[PDB]
Design a protein around this ligand. Structure first.
Ligand SMILES: Cc1cc2nc3c(=O)[nH]c(=O)nc-3n(C[C@H](O)[C@H](O)[C@H](O)COP(=O)(O)O)c2cc1C
Ligand code: SF4
Ligand code: SF4
Ligand code: SF4
Ligand code: SF4
Ligand code: SF4
Ligand code: FES
Ligand code: FES
Ligand SMILES: [K+]
Lengths: 453, 111, 218, 72, 183, 112
């Protein structure tokens, strides 16, 4: 299945403007802009495109909520160009390898949304990509593709780059707006929505890089061709970031609904150590829970097929786990990640993530009890559904995924740990001799795993 | 009696729990910041003619500062001598510390 | 402009755009709250006021969710009782055992609302311990014990919006976020001491009044 | 609870002229009457075969200054 | 990372140390403000802090106050922004910031070995600085380069698909004075 | 109502000719967000200008001669409190409770 959306995914055609035109990036730009948002919205709706940022929401439906702009009032469009999520390597390549493809998408999407400007939010660690992207933007300004006269058309449109300074929480749309406005970058409560009140108190839309970059092709190759791929309502293609316990990691541009077993075997070699050595797979990203071996044997990459099996297709970030790995330590790393990346305004995730991190540290060593497996599971329930943003939900699924399918492996650590210590451990990691003396807890193994420093 | 820590520091932090629980209102407490900044009381009175020797102050104490010794032979000629101030209660704590330690080591697990 | 909503089977009518927590008070229904004050800007960082909208699969914060016509609000279902106990447990996870030595003892909203809506038992037995936060010096009027703060931003909202003193804010991220002035300075405001009343916990207390009395005596 | 509800209703049916209302809490039945009806209700509850309350174990009062009639 | 929410006056970092953008950075800062609406010029705090950080070396308290005065904002508002993001170094730091990812995708492919090799070469534990003020080892979260999981970062440059024997060569290059090839 | 029930209550005459009672509804405490205590009407007596409190020299106790200093009656309605005060022939005055003005409060107002 050749002739995909992205063709420079391997750095073999250049990152210049002319090659992008030779690749078809800036083609019929005047005609598309003058077709009106009525046709652009319908094509996106008819193409079955869904949000690639992780939520999986119909892109066409979320663009119509923008109010009409007859008086040329300053509406805004924001491109969620930061990655943040562990195991995700999609947005970086689009910004780096094909900087001009995204810029073309912003104007075409902006025309549908009636946006007078575009702000690109890129990570501070992606300095080289931002510089390369800025070079493409400046060339497009000189070429006339950006500004008050977009290829003769009367639609005035500007593009700007805003760089974060390192925050996984800034990937969230409401927190992203706060960072641009000059605040800390804490997510807002959903009402009022960004469509009504957003950036600078103006209508705004936040979309992933992988969603904006597909828009030019949909407006050209028709929505029918894009909707042909995948199962029902999961229509489109997807970039998959594959890494972990695999032979040769890479990034591929397969279509939706492709089986997980075939995807890891068709390319990327195979599972390191054979298929019998597979312990677990974490698709989408670190947020979604893990899946065991037998479940993954018939998993189709979809927002619904992965939803049915108890997981989620957030950012197609597939993390492979062979049997020769520390599964509990891997999940413990996710818990420590969200504790450090918690913005810390709501009570649940500010305290729950720390609570989960403390309990996961004793599980990786076995200094706990079997009943505490249900305790930590209950604590994760107290986080979900009680937060302003979705980071609290994202910090509970990895722990629950460990408990759901890998509970016996967690019990094994507790049983093994009691052999070394001899006597069983009480709740919280206390022994029968542990007591506090002169400012410290003595006569008890303390889990010194709080990054020391 | 009012007890001390093994370092000699008073156990009471003038938290006024015992004064609130006291069914007979036999305890009077006045407190402020100490010279060094510690939360300590400067006035701790118990009316032994008003107390019903019920143990609520001992139960409510979060630091075991106020206790009741097994002593009963302290009948006095005058009723004034039954008005204990902080000096009398602290002296009782120093005098009866060893006997209080006997009772605590055997009754603390049941509390 | 009035909207006829329902709170636990009680008809309510308030101005459009009013929060659910405002309509609940008018209906006689009490909803626990820490971060909500009827004179400060709306914040939703404490999650203690969660209620269940009739037809919605998500729990809404009653202090920030606007009222609609025909909206039916439930505030005492077992789902909400679970939320109140869960949020209370998170608040008391890192809170120091300071009630005997803390001047807010007999007039603490954290104590009373944990007693009324939280569980009777705690489950925090971790050997690593609680968070420890150093005490900030902001002058001779406001005494700070920042271990007891529950990160409710009443002080930040008041001093910036009402008092007009922008030297007080939130610095840090996550569990390491600390209320204060970051640098070593004092709060300069003729109305700064009102922060003591607004602070629901013993994090901010009167320095002249420290240790001298309990509210039930007065 | 159910048996006392039926017995409490039976007393009101037998004495509609005197029994203002009745209440049941767990295993305790209370009959509410006016001062002019105290003698008749007590006489009925003492001599009726179905309700032979020969013993008056306690007579007490409570003060409610809010109401027009202070004492219950 | 090393997260402290309180500033303590030091001879290296105290408000008395004068700071001001050079004539080159004075002009480039004006272009940054032009990328924001005039009534929302407070949104340029983040680029201005990084502009001062690159000029001076780290986000000192003098830089934060300078940006606050430049944009007509209370100093505490700038303090909140600088202390919320981990790339604002509120300490002198070294010439080259060594950022090693320890997240699960990077941990699977042996990121632990990368940390072990560097610690016994530079003889500084994570969060420390070499005596000559040349290096700085820092433990960092995901940087996005997880397909090439054994990845490290030096200052603004990435280094992907590493081995413990390869990481020493990169350190040797910076110690000698030669820029290793990034990729 | 008009009946002078103080002639049979047995209370001393000083409660009528020398003491003033206050009928009031308790104000909401500034340190707490609860309003339970403000739902009832209460009656207390004004302090004696002399002898309300004095220090006992032996132990520092708070001595007093006001026998009504610790008496606070509870009422469910304002009318009930007035009717009882009138019935006992007390010299009283009513402190009308302060009512909080209602102002709409929404999260959108934080930006608009
Ligand atoms: C904690 C957190 C981090 C997030 N990080 C990202 C991100 O890095 N890139 C992205 O596109 N969406 C991210 N999202 C989701 C966005 O809020 C939103 O769903 C997305 O940007 C909308 O773009 P879409 O229409 O393409 O789905 C994050 C959400 C949360 C709660
Ligand atoms: S859930 Fe956590 S990260 Fe999200 S807004 Fe609340 S405190 Fe911040
Ligand atoms: S034992 Fe005596 S002093 Fe203690 S609470 Fe009981 S009555 Fe009061
Ligand atoms: S209960 Fe104990 S600590 Fe509290 S005031 Fe009384 S003696 Fe002191
Ligand atoms: S703030 Fe409240 S809960 Fe915390 S120590 Fe003080 S009295 Fe106890
Ligand atoms: S110090 Fe007090 S008022 Fe300020 S956020 Fe903490 S609990 Fe709220
Ligand atoms: S009172 Fe609503 S979340 Fe705090
Ligand atoms: S997990 Fe290390 S760069 Fe993403
Ligand atoms: K307070």
């Amino acid at each position: 299945d050749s002739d995909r959306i992205f063709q420079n995914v391997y750095s073999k055609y250049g990152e210049d403007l002319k090659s992008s035109q030779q690749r078809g990036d800036w083609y019929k730009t005047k005609e598309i802009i003058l077709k009106g948002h009525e046709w652009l919205i319908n094509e996106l709706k008819a193409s079955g495109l869904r949000g690639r940022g992780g939520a999986g929401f119909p892109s066409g439906l979320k663009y119509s909520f923008m109010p009409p702009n007859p008086n040329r009032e300053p509406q805004y469009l924001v491109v969620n160009a930061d990655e943040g999520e562990p195991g995700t390597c999609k947005d970086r390549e689009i910004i780096r390898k094909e900087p001009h493809k995204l810029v073309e998408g912003c104007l075409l999407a902006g025309r549908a949304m009636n946006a007078t400007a575009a702000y690109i939010y890129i990570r501070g660690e992606f300095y080289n990509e931002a510089v390369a992207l800025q070079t493409a933007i400046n060339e497009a300004y000189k070429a006339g593709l950006l500004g008050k006269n977009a290829c003769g058309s009367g639609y005035d449109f500007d593009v700007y780059i805003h760089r974060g300074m390192g925050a996984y929480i800034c990937g969230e749309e409401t927190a992203l707006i706060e960072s641009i406005e000059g605040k800390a970058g804490k997510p807002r409560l959903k009402p009022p929505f960004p469509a009504g009140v957003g950036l600078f108190g103006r209508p705004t839309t936040v979309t992933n890089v992988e969603t904006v970059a597909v828009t030019p092709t949909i407006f050209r190759r028709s929505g029918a061709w894009f909707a042909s791929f995948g199962r029902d309502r999961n229509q489109g293609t997807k970039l998959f970031c594959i890494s972990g316990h695999v032979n040769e990691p890479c990034t591929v541009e397969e279509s939706m609904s492709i089986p997980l077993k075939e995807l890891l075997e068709k390319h990327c070699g195979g599972i390191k150590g054979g298929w019998d050595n597979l312990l677990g797979v974490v698709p989408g990203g670190s947020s979604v829970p893990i899946m065991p071996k037998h479940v993954c044997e018939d998993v189709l990459m979809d927002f619904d097929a992965l939803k049915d099996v108890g997981s989620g297709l957030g950012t197609a970030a597939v993390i492979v786990l062979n049997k020769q790995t520390d599964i509990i330590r891997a999940i413990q790393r996710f818990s420590a990640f969200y504790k450090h990346e918690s913005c810390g305004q709501c009570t649940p995730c500010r305290e729950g993530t720390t609570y989960l991190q403390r309990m996961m540290d004793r599980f990786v060593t076995g200094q706990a009890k079997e009943k505490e497996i249900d305790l930590i599971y209950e604590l994760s329930k107290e986080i979900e559904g009680h937060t302003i943003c979705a980071l609290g939900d994202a910090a509970a699924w990895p722990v629950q995924g460990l408990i759901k399918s890998f509970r016996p492996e967690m019990v094994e650590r507790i049983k093994q740990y009691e052999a070394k210590l001899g006597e069983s451990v009480s709740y919280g990691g206390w022994t029968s001799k542990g007591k506090v003396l002169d400012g410290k807890v003595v006569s008890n193994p303390i889990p010194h795993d709080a990054h020391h420093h | 009696a009012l007890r001390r820590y093994p370092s000699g520091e008073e156990r009471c932090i003038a938290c006024k729990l015992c004064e609130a629980v006291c069914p007979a209102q036999a305890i009077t407490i006045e407190a402020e910041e100490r010279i060094d900044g510690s939360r300590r009381t400067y006035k701790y009175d118990i009316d032994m003619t008003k107390c019903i020797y019920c143990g609520y102050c001992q139960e409510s104490c979060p630091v075991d500062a106020i206790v009741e010794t097994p002593n009963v032979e302290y009948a006095t000629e005058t009723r004034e001598e039954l008005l204990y101030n902080k000096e009398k209660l602290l002296a009782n704590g120093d005098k009866w510390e060893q006997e209080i330690q006997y009772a605590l080591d055997a009754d603390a697990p049941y509390r | 402009k009035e909207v006829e909503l329902t709170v636990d089977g009680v008809k309510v009518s308030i101005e459009a755009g009013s929060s659910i927590i405002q309509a609940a008070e008018k209906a006689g229904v009490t909803i626990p709250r820490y971060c909500y004050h009827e004179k400060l800007a709306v914040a939703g960082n404490c999650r203690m006021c969660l209620v269940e909208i009739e037809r919605s699969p998500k729990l809404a914060a009653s202090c920030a969710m606007p009222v609609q016509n025909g909206m039916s609000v439930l505030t005492n279902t077992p789902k909400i009782k679970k939320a109140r106990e869960g949020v209370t447990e998170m608040l008391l996870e890192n809170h120091p055992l300071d009630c005997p030595v803390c001047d807010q003892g007999g007039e603490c909203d954290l104590q009373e609302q944990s007693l009324r809506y939280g569980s009777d038992r705690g489950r925090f037995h971790e050997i690593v311990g609680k968070r420890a936060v150093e005490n900030k010096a902001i002058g001779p009027l406001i005494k700070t014990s920042m271990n007891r703060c529950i990160h409710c931003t009443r002080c930040v909202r008041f001093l910036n919006d009402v008092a007009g003193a922008p030297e007080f804010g939130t610095a840090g991220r996550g569990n390491d976020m600390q209320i204060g002035t970051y640098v070593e300075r004092n709060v300069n405001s003729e109305l700064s001491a009102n922060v003591i009343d607004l602070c629901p916990v013993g994090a901010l207390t009167s320095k002249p009044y420290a240790f001298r009395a309990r509210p039930w005596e007065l | 609870i159910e048996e006392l509800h039926k017995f409490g209703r039976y007393i009101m049916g037998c004495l509609p002229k005197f029994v203002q209302q009745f209440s049941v809490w767990k295993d305790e039945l209370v009959i509410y009457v006016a001062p002019s009806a105290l003698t008749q209700v007590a006489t009925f509850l003492k001599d009726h075969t179905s309700a032979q309350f020969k013993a008056c174990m306690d007579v007490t009062a409570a003060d409610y200054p809010t109401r027009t009639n202070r004492f219950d | 990372s090393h997260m402290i929410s309180v500033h303590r006056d030091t001879p290296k970092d105290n408000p008395e140390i004068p700071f001001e953008f050079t004539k080159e950075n004075l002009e480039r800062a004006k272009e940054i403000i032009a990328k924001y609406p005039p009534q929302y010029k407070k949104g340029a705090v983040m680029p201005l802090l990084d502009l001062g950080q690159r000029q001076l070396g780290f986000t000192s308290i003098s830089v934060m106050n300078y940006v606050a005065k430049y944009l007509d904002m209370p100093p505490m508002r700038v303090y909140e922004v600088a202390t919320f993001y981990t790339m604002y170094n509120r300490k002198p730091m070294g010439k080259y910031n060594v950022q090693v990812c320890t997240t699960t995708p990077c941990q699977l492919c042996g990121s632990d070995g990368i940390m072990k090799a560097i610690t016994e070469h530079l003889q500084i534990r994570p969060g420390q600085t070499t005596p000559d003020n040349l290096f700085t080892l820092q433990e960092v979260e995901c940087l996005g380069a997880c397909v090439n999981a054994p990845m490290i970062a030096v200052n603004d440059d990435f280094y992907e698909d590493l081995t413990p024997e390869r990481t020493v060569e990169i350190l040797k290059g910076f110690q000698s004075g030669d820029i290793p090839k990034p990729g | 109502t008009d009946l002078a029930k103080e002639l049979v209550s047995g209370a001393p005459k000083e409660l009528i000719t020398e003491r003033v009672a206050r009928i009031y509804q308790e104000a909401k405490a500034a340190t707490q967000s609860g309003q339970h205590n403000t739902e009832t009407w209460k009656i207390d007596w004004d302090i004696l200008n002399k002898g309300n409190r004095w220090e006992n020299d032996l132990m520092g106790y708070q001595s007093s001669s006001d026998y009504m200093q610790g008496t606070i009656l509870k009422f469910d309605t304002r009318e009930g409190a007035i009717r009882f005060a009138k019935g006992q022939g007390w010299d009283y005055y009513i402190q009308e409770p302060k009512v909080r003005r209602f102002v709409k409060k929404d999260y959108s107002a934080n930006f608009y």
